[PDB]
């Protein structure tokens, strides 16, 4: 049977994960299609209610990782061993068995949303809420799904697919179209000007980054462009057009079209995005007949308030939101977005998403109001921004995730806070662990950062390995181009990795923000290399007592951990012959400038102090003949070097390697022997060769000529 409840125990492949499983908990593996390698779990109750806690069982001595909502809008990670350690508002839970990994996915069923939570007795409890007193229920069959496997990343994906086949309300990440912005460098106005952003400031920032040789090809005009008014009072949307700062200096009938033309035609941007809340603005839309806006006041749910008590006295909660009617929500988004699309705007960054869950009172609840708003947002986006131009922001609730049918980019953490020194380590931990779960739905966006900042290289390097959009919110003139050149090429393009950056197998269950012992290792893939980033992000975490992000004591400053080729979980998929491949890798340290050969399973020591990091490119070695091995590295002066290699063919019969490389700069490869000739576009070129390490090195001079996209490279051993 494989996943079953016998006696009062939940049993996974002959290991007891939970005990004391109460009588009223019903399971089922039946489906549409029809048996399933796991178990939908529900419960039946006496009373009809809008809220229910139900013990699923008792969890002891079984290491887990959780993503839990520390604010209404965002998730972060927590590890532990006992049920009591499971935070309120836990939305994804991963359990290990000392070999076997088990995922618990609390789900949406009908009008109800579920999350998990611990209590003092180590019970894992399932909290089912509708977010509206008028919407009540007593039986549930499908509120939690449990699935087990031996690869923890595959286990997660397989459970998500099964949940998709049941709900049909969302698509997996790999099934959605990414917007073009992910392939380019961008700039976001938010940290530069905040709400004081003007059209002259937008131009200033685009101009200054292009001047330094790293021209952005997209821009996010962030919060500050819209027309808003007060009734410290909350602002509400008064119209869908732009405010006075984005009307031309001259002719007020030309609006945001102006900064769009200037960005595109004058400054050579490809895309322009703008920001709006899902509700219009922070305080919604000013009440009116037009969009049916009526004042609503956020309802507090206990889990949220327990972890984020300041949400109780937040401005949106006390002063309320003008909530567009469901009957009119499509009209609202379509008229807003039609205006923008007609002005040359290519997408929207849509924020404040989770409020919807608090406004379902009298309206069907949190799941239904969320489905309705998202259905209409998705229609409006597909219509008006057909490049799928939507970035999800403040959207870490499951209500939204399990109805994510179209949108393909999601902010994966709380904001970048240039001025809060506690935030930087936490940001990196959060973004990695959250991406384990959010990445199954959308491509994670690791947020803007600043190029001139003490933690600049820490953020930048992590963004390079994220697989996400790469953008800064530098103020005009406050740039570090030596840093930016490691991320962005002269035409604005980046070296994006294929997957969401994620923690390695050996970090999934060791909390690198809290355990004072481990470095965080993050992996990702390119076509022909993996990449691995190592971070000491110790010293700071969300506190369960203070309920906010704080510094905490750690015994050392410096920590030692180890790196292995197989830390890059999917590294086989970079090898040109994964059946013959013996598992050995060329490991290039970006910072130290060192190439080392690492045999399958051999560990390499890495030492890092807090806020330090190191990036390694990891290339499977190909064995052409005895004594002639090779592995491509890529653009060695960029963080994700391996991201440059577009094609790779080994012709062992002619002792030759053929590569298609994009970009320009110093190219690097591993070779156990001195090449005979290195050729770039049918022309021999000079190279250097470190005989001791095998590092081959030459210059790719210009960006590819044309339109012709890749440099063709032949390395002749
Ligand atoms: O207006 C700025 C916009 O709001 C941001 O949300 C912030 C908010 O400003 C905070 O201070 C908290 O309320 C919340 O935790 C936090 O994520 C978006 O992430 C995004 O960068 C966007 O530009």
Curated annotation (Swiss-Prot):
InterPro entries from the UniProt entry: Aldolase_TIM, Glycoside_hydrolase_SF, Glycosyl_hydrolases_36
Induction info reads: By oxidative stress and by dark treatment. Down-regulated by sucrose, but not by osmotic treatment.
Under SUPFAM superfamilies, the record lists:
(Trans)glycosidases
Q: What Gene3D superfamilies would the database entry show?
A: Aldolase class I
Q: Which domain of life is it from?
A: Eukaryota
Swiss-Prot/TrEMBL catalytic activity: alpha-D-galactosyl-(1->3)-1D-myo-inositol + sucrose = raffinose + myo-inositol
Q: What is its EC number?
A: 2.4.1.82
Q: Does the keyword Transferase apply?
A: yes
User: TM spans, by residue?
Assistant: none
> Tell me, what does this protein do in biology?
Transglycosidase operating by a ping-pong reaction mechanism. Involved in the synthesis of raffinose, a major soluble carbohydrate in seeds, roots and tubers.
What is the name listed in the Swiss-Prot or TrEMBL entry for this protein? Probable galactinol--sucrose galactosyltransferase 6
Q: Which gene encodes it?
A: RFS6
